[PDB]
Each structure stands twice: as structure tokens, then as C-alpha cells.
Write a protein that binds this ligand. Structure first.
Ligand SMILES: NC1=NC(=O)C2=N[C@H]3C(S)=C(SO)[C@@H](COP(=O)(O)OP(=O)(O)OC[C@H]4O[C@@H](n5cnc6c(=O)[nH]c(N)nc65)[C@H](O)[C@@H]4O)O[C@H]3NC2=N1
Ligand SMILES: NC1=NC(=O)C2=N[C@H]3C(S)=C(S)[C@@H](COP(=O)(O)OP(=O)(O)OC[C@H]4O[C@@H](n5cnc6c(=O)[nH]c(N)nc65)[C@H](O)[C@@H]4O)O[C@H]3NC2=N1
Ligand SMILES: [Mo+4]
Length: 773
């Protein structure tokens, strides 16, 4: 049995593992990581926790009746252990049956999910590689993070914008006077990366504090970002930011302070927005006082912020929760409109940025080469690659096969899907309106899942296959989504546990049974694939003047780092500002479009041709709103979505075993609720249990229940059954942001809370199904 140390990486950072007698016993942060994540201990625990999946399993009803099975019992845990050979024969036969009977339109292979980093063991790309060989599949477009913003931005500034490099952190330290975090908590969300994170935001934030820059945070919650800077904290009722921005804009026009020259030379359509802002079109001037009535933020505060932003070099750093809501396209469109009025776009330290809270945006880019990995059979964000539906319309598709839907000016039809194959994702936690979804999933004949933890998604599968973690195999990956700091060897730490197999090995075996083995593997093995990716990067590096060692020398060192040349001076939009005729934006006019003729032509009632305030489905203190509290259903501090819920880390935040619910003292007192009580949170769509922590960190009228809790239904056959653990998507609605983007509205949620006085409940989500032990 092995003893020693091994370096590898994850979505949480680079680390060194201590191995004792073949078992990993500790993960220590990389010495060069400026700010390691406390979640590292949970990553290690996830390899061995009680919810680790040991063996391949088939749902008893499916085993016995196939397509004639009772599908309402999916998720009850009645599984049968089978041999790998049995399982693989069955998966291959079902993939082939569905392809022959229903065509490529019958197989949904979108499989949205955060998986693990790695250019070779990329489970969702490996899935599509196999499905391509089987005949084809239906894919998903966009993502749950910026579903609205990523579609409206190309019509406004010409490009995606949310996944692009930001003005560098050091430029902000030397030039910014006022830093605004608008619906962003960079301290919380900078802990992880899509590829390995370098944690570059932490040094950048520390430099702003040491410089004494004024920081303002606009968020309903008093976060660690507020606490780190001792920031001026503005607390708007959730979903009212657009009203606040309009009041600011109206103030700038009324006091004649806005930058008329910037508007004249770099934007288009301000004259069509002005009449709306002044109330000529609807008899409602969008004043600060009007904005106060909707948002609850004092009119004088709105006016003072507007004046301050106009007189100082200001950076508006906005997060994505405010577009993960009904009419979400309006939030960042209005933010860019406000930024245009301020006139600092393209100046060092001024303007706006939509990725300072995500995967190190702003950390200086190096001059190193790009690393490529296995493909599905064929250059931007890898997940953005009737064959395609907007990702959040998956349940609408299941309920309405053949029906039409709108998307970015086109009309398409939903395909008629009969099977879904999910790897590296957890839709039974990430998707909205759980009770609707539970019923909709009965439309599928067959549901196959691969994972290494017994998530709610794996519990609901017909066929579950145990995957390995990254720590039981070898791989290669980039350090830094934007910085490109280096390339890491993700070395094997321990042998595969139980009967777990890599997703690559599973799909290769399924491809073999379809008669397409060599087409899937390309005759290469694990290390042959990894060397081919490295060799390609090195060849590209050589041409650019970056020297890189030979493959075995790189593997022996475990990492290669690249040099920073001019990356620290990057200023976004500087060339556009310098010469807009030589360097125009990718819009129809070449300028920032405040009014879009293109969008006007679409004629969508829920996405007008300029930024507009519209009432959402439900909002805190909205006219005729049924429920009294808004749920800030945001990203977890001590999980990566659902990942790590079934680990030792849960002990640090669970309240009486349930997901925590933060509640203001006055809201708790009105309901006779005390700190630590178990409470039932409910609305017309569902009911869940959570454990309360009383704090004035959350503003009055708002409760915080993070997304990612492992749904643990009392009885799967009972419609609307109580969730015993606390999955906040039991309460959200499943609707599109608008006809333009069809994004998810996971943070448009109102509910009521009462002390739970019902029968005691037993938690079953954190131990494996009895038959799987
Ligand atoms: N109400 C909501 N509010 C929200 O704010 C919210 N966030 C969105 C967003 S923004 C996202 S991500 O753009 C999704 C995340 O859902 P996802 O299914 O990616 O969640 P994870 O908990 O990270 O599931 C990953 C899944 O994959 C398994 N896994 C890891 N490595 C491997 C591997 O190598 N091989 C396999 N077979 N499986 C692997 C993990 O174990 C894990 O289970 O959430 C939205 N919802 C929101 N709602
Ligand atoms: N630790 C951690 N866990 C994760 O799960 C995680 N996920 C990653 C992913 S995939 C993404 S997409 C990003 C998400 O990055 P994103 O900016 O979407 O993060 P959220 O936690 O949903 O919301 C950020 C802040 O918005 C505030 N907020 C909510 N509603 C409103 C509102 O109406 N108005 C205003 N002004 N503020 C509001 C919340 O209180 C929260 O503090 O984080 C990434 N980083 C992550 N880090
Ligand atoms: Mo996301």
C-alpha cells in the first residue's frame, strides 16, 4: 500500500494530497494560492462519504417492466445491484432502441452540469461523443448563470460580455475612486473556477481596501463583501434594481449632469429612451421618488448615489442574481445604459464589468497558449457549444412535444424526447419547480445517470452507474479561466473505489456495443490522450515564443506557469473609446444600443426595445402579492451548488439537520419563531423544511435559503410531498425570463414561513439507499 504525497487540482483550487496506506488523509492548499477555499476538506471527504456510489444499479420496476414500468415510484430507492456487464448491455440496448424507434430527436443529451475540471475526463463532452456515434441527440443552449444577460448583451454591446476579460485588477487599484458591487458578492463566489481557479480576485480586493477606495454594495444581504470593506450598504427589495437605476438616470437628466458627448458619439437610441424616462409615454416620470415607492430605498439616497457616480471614477461591478429572474434581460441592459450616461466606459478604472465575481475575471492574462481537450466529434466557453433548446425549457419540452417556442427572434418546435442521459449534473436540485418536474419526468421511458454521489438525480434514475472522482484518475487542465496562469497535471491520488469506473471507460464500453469502439477511443489510452493535448499546447507555445518542457519533464514537475507581458494593463473598451470608427462594436450601428431596432422588430411584449420597468410574476410588496417574504435563493457559501452537501462540511451549517434559513429578527418574532427552530417554508408550488438562524444580516422581508440542498421527499408518490431537507427549487417557478432569452427565473420567489409543529421527520438523503450498501 502506497505512502506519499501527490499534487492535483479541482474546481476549488490546486492542492497536495497526503496518502497513507493507499488512502487520502488530507488535502493541503498549494503554497502559491493567495486565498484557499475552506471547502477543500469536504472535497477529500466526498471520495469516501456514506453517499459514495459503490455499484451499478437498476431500478427494480425498470428491470422487471422496461417501458411499462410504473414511473411514479422513481426516487423511492428500490434498486437492484447488477454486474457491470449487465448494466452496460442494458444501457447500450436502450440507447439503440430509442435511436431506431424515435430518431435523434428522442434522446436528450444536454446534460447540463458543473462536473469536474479536466480536458480528458470531461463527462458531458464524452456523453455527446458517444451519442453522436449512436445517431444524434437533442442538446441544450445557454446556461443557468447568465441565461438572460448572455442573449441581450450581443444586441447592446455586440458580444456576450459576461464571459470576457475585465479591466485588470491593478488598473482598478491605481485609478478607481468608487467601486460598486451591484448584486455581487465576490468574496463568496470567487472561491471556485470552471477550470482550476487561481483565486485572483482576493489580492485585487485587498489592494482596493489598502488604497482606501470608497466601496458601495447594493444587495439585500449584508455579505462578507460588505464586511471586508466596511462598505456603504444599500438594501433594495429584491427585483427592484431596474427601478433604482431609472431613478438614478432621471436624476442625472433632471439636474443636467449626464455626459451628453459620450451619449452623442458612442451610443444609439437615447432620444427614444428619454421620453419613457421623463414619463411622456405613460404619464409616469421615473423619478427617484417613484423608485423609492417600488424599491424601498430612500429617494435622497438614490439621488446622492447618482451624483457621486458622475463626479468620481466609478466601476460598476455587477453580479448575475438580478438577471436570474423574470424580465432578467432588463437588469444589465439598464446598467449599461446608466454606465453610458456616466461617460466613463473605456477609461482606466471606469465603466462596468460583469465578471469580477466569477472565476478570477480581472486577473491579468498571461501570454501562454490555450489548452484543448477531447471533443464530441468536431472555441469559446465549452458549455455554449429542433436539435437545440434553451437549457431551462427542459420541462416545458417534456410537457409540450411539438409545440412552438420563441427565442431571440426565431420560432422553433420542441422535440419529442423519450430518454434522457445525465452525467456531471444534478437537475433534481438545479432545475426550478420541483413538483412540476417530478410529474413531467414520467414522460420519459428511460433515465440514465452517472455520478459518484447519491444525489437526488441519481436517486431518480432507472439506471445508475458509479463514476470515479478526478482523484482516482489522471488528467490535465488550465489554471485560470481568464488568467491562463499555467497548466496542471491532475495526477491520480488513489485507486478507483468499489466498482466505480471513469465516465470515459463507461462510454467506451457502450460505444463498443454499438459497433463503434475505435471511433470513440481513437486507439488512444488515458496517458496517450493527455500527452496529445499537452503536445498541441507546446507546439502552439513554441510558435508564440513561450518555452515549454517536453511532456515527461512537465509531468515530473506537475505544473508549467506562463509569463505576464502586457496583461496587467488591459482596459476594457479602451480601443472603442479611443477611436469608435476604426474600432466599432459588433452591433448593427457599431455603437452601444440603448434602443434596439432589431429587438423592436421581434414584437415581444415581455422584452421591449429599450430598458423598461415591468411588473414581475411575483415580488416583495408587489400589488396583490400573495406571500410576504422574498427568498434570496442564491449561491451557497460552503458548497459548489449541490456538491459537497453529503460530506462532513454539512455539520458546520445544518440547523437540526436541515439546510439553514436566515431570517430577520422582526420577521421571526412576528411568527413566534426562535433561533434554531425547524420551520416549514411554503407557497402555492411546494413546501420544504429548513432550520432557522436569526440575524439582521438579511433585510426585513427577505429570507436567505441557498440553492443546492439535496431534495429529500417524504413520499415520492404523494403529489406536493414535503421536502425534509431544504431544496429551495421546490418553491421556485419554472418560467422564461422573456421570449428573447428564455432564461431561468430561479430567484423570482415569494413564500410564507411558519414554525414546524408536524410529526417528527427522519432525514434519508445523506445515507445510501438500503440496497446500495
Ligand atoms: N433557485 C436557483 N438559484 C440559483 O441561483 C441557481 N443557480 C443555477 C446555476 S448558475 C447553476 S450553474 O451556471 C446550476 C448548477 O447546477 P449543477 O447540476 O452544475 O450542480 P452541481 O451540484 O455542480 O452538479 C454537478 C454534479 O456532477 C457530479 N460530478 C462531478 N464530477 C463528475 C464526474 O467526473 N463524472 C460524473 N458522472 N459526475 C460528476 C457531482 O457529483 C454533482 O452531483 O444551478 C442552477 N440552479 C439555481 N437555482
Ligand atoms: N462558493 C460558491 N458556490 C457556488 O455555488 C458558486 N457558483 C458559481 C456559479 S455557476 C455562478 S453562475 C456564480 C453566481 O454568481 P451570482 O452574482 O449569480 O451569485 P448569487 O450568490 O446568485 O447572487 C449574488 C448576490 O446577489 C444578491 N442579490 C439577490 N437578489 C438580488 C437583487 O434582487 N438585487 C440585488 N441588488 N442583489 C441581489 C444576493 O444576496 C447575493 O449576495 O457563482 C459562482 N461561484 C460560486 N461560489
Ligand atoms: Mo452558473
Amino acid at each position: 500500500l502506497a505512502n506519499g504525497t501527490v499534487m492535483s487540482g479541482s474546481h476549488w483550487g490546486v492542492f497536495t494530497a497526503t496518502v497513507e496506506n493507499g488512502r487520502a488523509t488530507a488535502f493541503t492548499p498549494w503554497e502559491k494560492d493567495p486565498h484557499p477555499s475552506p471547502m477543500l476538506a469536504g472535497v477529500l471527504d466526498s471520495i469516501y462519504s456514506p453517499t459514495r456510489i459503490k455499484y451499478p444499479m437498476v431500478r427494480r420496476e425498470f428491470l422487471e417492466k422496461g417501458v411499462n414500468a410504473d414511473r411514479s415510484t422513481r426516487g423511492n430507492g428500490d434498486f437492484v445491484r447488477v454486474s457491470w456487464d449487465q448494466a452496460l448491455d442494458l444501457v447500450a440496448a436502450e440507447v439503440k432502441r430509442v435511436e431506431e424507434t424515435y430518431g435523434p430527436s428522442g434522446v436528450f443529451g444536454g446534460s447540463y452540469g458543473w462536473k469536474s475540471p479536466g480536458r480528458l475526463h470531461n463527462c458531458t463532452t464524452l456523453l455527446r461523443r458517444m451519442l453522436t456515434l449512436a445517431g444524434g441527440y437533442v442538446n441544450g443552449a445557454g446556461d443557468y448563470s447568465t441565461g438572460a444577460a448572455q442573449v441581450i448583451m450581443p444586441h447592446v454591446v455586440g458580444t456576450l460580455e459576461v464571459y470576457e476579460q475585465q479591466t485588470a485588477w491593478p488598473v482598478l487599484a491605481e485609478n478607481t475612486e468608487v467601486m460598486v458591487f451591484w448584486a455581487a458578492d465576490p468574496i463568496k463566489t470567487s472561491q471556485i473556477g470552471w477550470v482550476i481557479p487561481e483565486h485572483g480576485a482576493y489580492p485585487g480586493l485587498e489592494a482596493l481596501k489598502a488604497k482606501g477606495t470608497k466601496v458601495i454594495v447594493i444587495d439585500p444581504v449584508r455579505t462578507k463583501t460588505v464586511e471586508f470593506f466596511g462598505a456603504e450598504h444599500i438594501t433594495p427589495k429584491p427585483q427592484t434594481d431596474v427601478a433604482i437605476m431609472l431613478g438614478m438616470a432621471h436624476t442625472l437628466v433632471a439636474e443636467d449632469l449626464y455626459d451628453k458627448d459620450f451619449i452623442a458619439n458612442y451610443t444609439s437610441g437615447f432620444d427614444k429612451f428619454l421620453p419613457y424616462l421623463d414619463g411622456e409615454t405613460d404619464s409616469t416620470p421615473k423619478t427617484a421618488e417613484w423608485a423609492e415607492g417600488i424599491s424601498g430605498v430612500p429617494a435622497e439616497t438614490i439621488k446622492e448615489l447618482a451624483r457621486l457616480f458622475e463626479s468620481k471614477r466609478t466601476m460598476l461591478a455587477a453580479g448575475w442574481s438580478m438577471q436570474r429572474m423574470h424580465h432578467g434581460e432588463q437588469a444589465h441592459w439598464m446598467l449599461v445604459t446608466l454606465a453610458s450616461m456616466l461617460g466613463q466606459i473605456g477609461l482606466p478604472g471606469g465603466g462596468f464589468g460583469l465578471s469580477y465575481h466569477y472565476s478570477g475575471g480581472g486577473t491579468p492574462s498571461t501570454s501562454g497558449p490555450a489548452l484543448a481537450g477531447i471533443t464530441d466529434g468536431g472555441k469559446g466557453p465549452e458549455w455554449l457549444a429542433a436539435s437545440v433548446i434553451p437549457v431551462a425549457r427542459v420541462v416545458d419540452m417534456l410537457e409540450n412535444p411539438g409545440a412552438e417556442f420563441d427565442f431571440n427572434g426565431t420560432r422553433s418546435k420542441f422535440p419529442d424526447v423519450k430518454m434522457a442521459y445525465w452525467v456531471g449534473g444534478n437537475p433534481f436540485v438545479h432545475h426550478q419547480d420541483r413538483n412540476r418536474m417530478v410529474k413531467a419526468w414520467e414522460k420519459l421511458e428511460t433515465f440514465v445517470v452517472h455520478d459518484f454521489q447519491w444525489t437526488p438525480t441519481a436517486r431518480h434514475a432507472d439506471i445508475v452507474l458509479p463514476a470515479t472522482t478526478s482523484y482516482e484518475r489522471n488528467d490535465i487542465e488550465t489554471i485560470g479561466d481568464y488568467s491562463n496562469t499555467g497548466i496542471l497535471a491532475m495526477k491520480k491520488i488513489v485507486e478507483p473505489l468499489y466498482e466505480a469506473r471513469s465516465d470515459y471507460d463507461i462510454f467506451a464500453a457502450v460505444a463498443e456495443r454499438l459497433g463503434k469502439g475505435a471511433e470513440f477511443t481513437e486507439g488512444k489510452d488515458e496517458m496517450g490522450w493527455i500527452k496529445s493535448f499537452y503536445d498541441d499546447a507546446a507546439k502552439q507555445g513554441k510558435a508564440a515564443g513561450v518555452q515549454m518542457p517536453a511532456f515527461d519533464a512537465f509531468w515530473a514537475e506537475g505544473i508549467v506557469e506562463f509569463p505576464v507581458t502586457d496583461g496587467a494593463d488591459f482596459v476594457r473598451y479602451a480601443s472603442f473609446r479611443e477611436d469608435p470608427l476604426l474600432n466599432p462594436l459588433g452591433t448593427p450601428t457599431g455603437l452601444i444600443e440603448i434602443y434596439s431596432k432589431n429587438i423592436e422588430k421581434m414584437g415581444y411584449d415581455d422584452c421591449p426595445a429599450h430598458p423598461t420597468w415591468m411588473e414581475p410574476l411575483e415580488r416583495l410588496d408587489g400589488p396583490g402579492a400573495k406571500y410576504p417574504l422574498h427568498i434570496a435563493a442564491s449561491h451557497p457559501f460552503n458548497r459548489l451548488h449541490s456538491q459537497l452537501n453529503g460530506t462532513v462540511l454539512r455539520e458546520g451549517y445544518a440547523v437540526q439537520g436541515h439546510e439553514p434559513c436566515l431570517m430577520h429578527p422582526d420577521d421571526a418574532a412576528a411568527r413566534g419563531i426562535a433561533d434554531g427552530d425547524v420551520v416549514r417554508v411554503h407557497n402555492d408550488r411546494g413546501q420544504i423544511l429548513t432550520g432557522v438562524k436569526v440575524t439582521d444580516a438579511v433585510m426585513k422581508g427577505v429570507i436567505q435559503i441557498y440553492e443546492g440542498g439535496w431534495y429529500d421527499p417524504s413520499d415520492v408518490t404523494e403529489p406536493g410531498t414535503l421536502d425534509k431537507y431544504g431544496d429551495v427549487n421546490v418553491l421556485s417557478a419554472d418560467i422564461g425570463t422573456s421570449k428573447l432569452a428564455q432564461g431561468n427565473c430561479g430567484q423570482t420567489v415569494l413564500a410564507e414561513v411558519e414554525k414546524y409543529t408536524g410529526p417528527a421527520v427522519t432525514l434519508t438523503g445523506f445515507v445510501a439507499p438500503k440496497a446500495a450498501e
